[PDB]
XYZ file of C-alpha atoms in Angstrom:
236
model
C -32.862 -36.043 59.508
C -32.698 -37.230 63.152
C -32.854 -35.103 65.957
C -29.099 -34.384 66.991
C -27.402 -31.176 67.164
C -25.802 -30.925 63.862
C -23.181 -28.334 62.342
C -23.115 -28.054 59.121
C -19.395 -27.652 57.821
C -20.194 -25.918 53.899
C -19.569 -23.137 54.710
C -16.204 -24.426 55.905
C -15.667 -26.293 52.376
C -14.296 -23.045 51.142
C -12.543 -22.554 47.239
C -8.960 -22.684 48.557
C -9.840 -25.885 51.009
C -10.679 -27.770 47.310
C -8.034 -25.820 45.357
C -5.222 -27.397 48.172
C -6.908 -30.748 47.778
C -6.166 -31.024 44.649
C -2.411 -29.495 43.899
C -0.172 -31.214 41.756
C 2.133 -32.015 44.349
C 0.784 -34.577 46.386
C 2.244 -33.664 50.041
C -0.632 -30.366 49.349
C -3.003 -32.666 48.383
C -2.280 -34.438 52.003
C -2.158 -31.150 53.919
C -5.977 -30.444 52.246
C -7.013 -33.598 53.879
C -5.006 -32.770 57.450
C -7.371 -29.371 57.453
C -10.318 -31.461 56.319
C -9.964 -33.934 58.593
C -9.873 -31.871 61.787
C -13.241 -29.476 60.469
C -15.021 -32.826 60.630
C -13.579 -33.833 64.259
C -14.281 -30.201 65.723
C -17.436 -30.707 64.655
C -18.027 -34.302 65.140
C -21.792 -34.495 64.145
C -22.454 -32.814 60.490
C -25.145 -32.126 58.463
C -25.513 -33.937 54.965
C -24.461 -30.469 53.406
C -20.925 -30.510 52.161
C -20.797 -27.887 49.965
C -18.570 -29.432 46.869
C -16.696 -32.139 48.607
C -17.946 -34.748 47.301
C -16.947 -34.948 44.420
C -13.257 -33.340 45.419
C -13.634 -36.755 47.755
C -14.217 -38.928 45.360
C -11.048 -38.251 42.939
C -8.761 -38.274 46.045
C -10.072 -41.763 46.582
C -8.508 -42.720 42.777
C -5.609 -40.589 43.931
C -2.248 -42.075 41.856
C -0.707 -41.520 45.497
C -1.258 -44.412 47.223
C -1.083 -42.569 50.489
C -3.309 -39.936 49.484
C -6.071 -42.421 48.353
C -5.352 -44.301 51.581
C -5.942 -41.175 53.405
C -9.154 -40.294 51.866
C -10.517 -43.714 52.586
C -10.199 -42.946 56.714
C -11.576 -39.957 55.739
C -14.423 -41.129 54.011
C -14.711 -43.204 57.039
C -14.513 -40.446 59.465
C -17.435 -38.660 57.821
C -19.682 -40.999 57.828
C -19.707 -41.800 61.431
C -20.255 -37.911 61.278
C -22.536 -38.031 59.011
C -24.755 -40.593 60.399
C -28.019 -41.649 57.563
C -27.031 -38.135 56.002
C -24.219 -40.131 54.404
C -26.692 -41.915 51.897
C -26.725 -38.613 49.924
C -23.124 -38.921 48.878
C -23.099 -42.667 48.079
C -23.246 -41.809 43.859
C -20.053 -40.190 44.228
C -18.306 -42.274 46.938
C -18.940 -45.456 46.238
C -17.608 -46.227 42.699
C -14.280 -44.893 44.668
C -14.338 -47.845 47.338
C -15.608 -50.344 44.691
C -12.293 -49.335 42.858
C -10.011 -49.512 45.596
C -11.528 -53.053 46.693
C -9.187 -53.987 43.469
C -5.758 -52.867 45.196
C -2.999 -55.240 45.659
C -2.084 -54.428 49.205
C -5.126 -56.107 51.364
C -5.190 -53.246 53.993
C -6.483 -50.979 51.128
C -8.867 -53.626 50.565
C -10.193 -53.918 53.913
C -10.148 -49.948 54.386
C -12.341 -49.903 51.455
C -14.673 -52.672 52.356
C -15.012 -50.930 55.819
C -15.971 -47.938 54.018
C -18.718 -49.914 52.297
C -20.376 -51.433 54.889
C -20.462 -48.404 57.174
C -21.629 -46.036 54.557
C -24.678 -49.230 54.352
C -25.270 -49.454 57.980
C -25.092 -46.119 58.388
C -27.392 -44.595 55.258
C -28.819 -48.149 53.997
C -27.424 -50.433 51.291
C -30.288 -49.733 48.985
C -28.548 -46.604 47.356
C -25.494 -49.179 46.332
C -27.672 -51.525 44.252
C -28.529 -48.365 41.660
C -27.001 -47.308 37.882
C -24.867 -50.469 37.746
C -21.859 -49.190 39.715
C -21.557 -52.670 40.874
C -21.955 -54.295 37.351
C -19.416 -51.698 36.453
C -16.827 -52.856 38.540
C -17.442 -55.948 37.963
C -17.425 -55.577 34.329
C -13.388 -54.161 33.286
C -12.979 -55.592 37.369
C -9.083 -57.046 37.876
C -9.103 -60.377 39.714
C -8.936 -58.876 43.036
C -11.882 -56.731 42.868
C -14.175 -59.492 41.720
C -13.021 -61.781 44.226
C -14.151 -58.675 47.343
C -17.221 -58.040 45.163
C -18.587 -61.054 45.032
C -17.696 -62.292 48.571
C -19.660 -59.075 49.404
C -22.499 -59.519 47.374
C -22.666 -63.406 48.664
C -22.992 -61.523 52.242
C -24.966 -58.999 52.104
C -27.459 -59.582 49.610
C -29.255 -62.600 51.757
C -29.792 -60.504 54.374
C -31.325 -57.645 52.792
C -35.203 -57.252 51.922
C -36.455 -56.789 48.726
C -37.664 -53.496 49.135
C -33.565 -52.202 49.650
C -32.491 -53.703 46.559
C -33.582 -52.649 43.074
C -34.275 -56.076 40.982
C -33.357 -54.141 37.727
C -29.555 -53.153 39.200
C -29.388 -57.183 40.769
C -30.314 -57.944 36.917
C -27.533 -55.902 35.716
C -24.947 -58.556 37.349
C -26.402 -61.579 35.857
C -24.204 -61.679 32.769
C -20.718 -61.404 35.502
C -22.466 -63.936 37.457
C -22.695 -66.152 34.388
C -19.226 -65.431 33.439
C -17.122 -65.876 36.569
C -19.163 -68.905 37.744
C -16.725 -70.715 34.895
C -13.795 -67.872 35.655
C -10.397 -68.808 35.289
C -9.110 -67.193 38.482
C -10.264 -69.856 41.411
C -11.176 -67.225 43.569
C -13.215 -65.735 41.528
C -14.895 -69.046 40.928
C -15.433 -69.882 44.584
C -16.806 -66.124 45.794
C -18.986 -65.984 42.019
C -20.779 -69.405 42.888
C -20.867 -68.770 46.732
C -23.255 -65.142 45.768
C -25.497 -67.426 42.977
C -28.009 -67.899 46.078
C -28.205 -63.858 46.984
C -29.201 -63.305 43.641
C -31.634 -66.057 42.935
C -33.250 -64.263 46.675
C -33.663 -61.460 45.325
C -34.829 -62.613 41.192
C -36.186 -66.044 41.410
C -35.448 -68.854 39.641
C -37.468 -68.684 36.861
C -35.956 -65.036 36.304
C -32.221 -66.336 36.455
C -33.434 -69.376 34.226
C -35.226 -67.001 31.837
C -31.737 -65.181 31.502
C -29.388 -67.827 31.011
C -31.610 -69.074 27.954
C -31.645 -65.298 26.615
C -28.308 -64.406 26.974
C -26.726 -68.007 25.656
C -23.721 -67.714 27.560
C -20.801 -70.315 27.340
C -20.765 -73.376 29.463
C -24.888 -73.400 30.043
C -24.490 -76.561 31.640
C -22.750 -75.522 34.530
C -24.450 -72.131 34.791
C -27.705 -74.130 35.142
C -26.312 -76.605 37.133
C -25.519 -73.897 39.428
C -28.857 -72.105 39.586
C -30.415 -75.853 40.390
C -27.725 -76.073 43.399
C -28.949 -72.888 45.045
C -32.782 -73.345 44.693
C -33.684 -75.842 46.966
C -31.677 -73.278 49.436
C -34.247 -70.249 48.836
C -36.368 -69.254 51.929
């Protein structure tokens, strides 16, 4: 922890606070978040201790209210910046949440979520993201719009961060998408897929990537290797 005054606002994160987050009726739901949102401006600097939140957080952020799971994105927002590198501890819960929401059809949901993403990673570091496959996981089942945000933000981020904040084993995890939406049928997903092939290969090597395109036989090896042999003379 640094060295700022921090309150910390479990106590705050009472029964009835999560009970009214999570009414059936949706306009409760929204008055939870109106009380929620104005503990964490009164107190503007928090502790990493949120009691249960969390978790309550993370199912208003796959809200079936659109304007609830809106909401909880500026939330989620709102307490990081409060949060400051506290905010790393929450990332297991939070983050499959704004991974999801990078698939929504309106793109001010996607750029909320994004946002969400990359200040939870300045804010906490982006090595707790690249851990238990939640990105292979969106990726995975991941609607055309989600893989298209995930791997422009993979293409991104991943050449500018040292080894040591990204696990090889969770970058492994994404080779068989990689392989897959190199040759997708969506030309988006095409462009953003081949654009994050040199990100990877930073972080695994050629001879790693090489060594799983020969293991896995995926379709159309040709092009997947012809892709791999495009981004090496590129590697630092």
């Amino acid at each position: 922890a640094d060295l700022l005054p921090r309150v910390d606002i479990a106590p705050q994160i009472t029964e009835a606070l999560l009970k009214e987050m999570s009414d059936k009726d949706w306009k409760t739901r929204n008055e939870g978040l109106t009380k929620l949102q104005a503990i964490i401006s009164e107190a503007r600097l928090i502790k990493p201790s949120i009691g249960d939140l969390a978790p309550a957080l993370a199912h208003r952020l796959v809200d079936s209210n659109a304007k609830i799971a809106q909401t909880t994105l500026a939330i989620c927002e709102q307490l990081a910046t409060a949060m400051g590198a506290g905010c790393r501890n929450h990332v297991r819960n939070l983050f499959p949440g704004f991974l999801h929401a990078l698939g929504d059809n309106k793109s001010f949901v996607r750029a909320a979520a994004l946002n969400c993403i990359n200040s939870f990673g300045e804010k906490g570091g982006y090595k707790e993201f690249f851990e238990s496959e939640m990105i292979a996981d969106a990726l995975k089942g991941g609607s055309p719009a989600l893989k298209t945000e995930l791997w422009a933000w993979l293409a991104d981020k991943l050449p500018g961060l040292p080894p040591k904040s990204v696990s090889k084993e969770d970058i492994h995890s994404m080779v068989p998408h990689l392989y897959a939406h190199i040759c997708d049928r969506n030309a988006d997903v095409r462009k953003n897929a081949n654009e994050a092939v040199l990100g990877i290969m930073i972080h695994l090597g050629f001879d790693a990537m090489n060594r799983a395109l020969d293991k896995q036989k995926p379709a159309s090896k040709k092009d997947i290797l012809a892709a791999l042999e495009k981004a090496r003379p590129n590697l630092p």
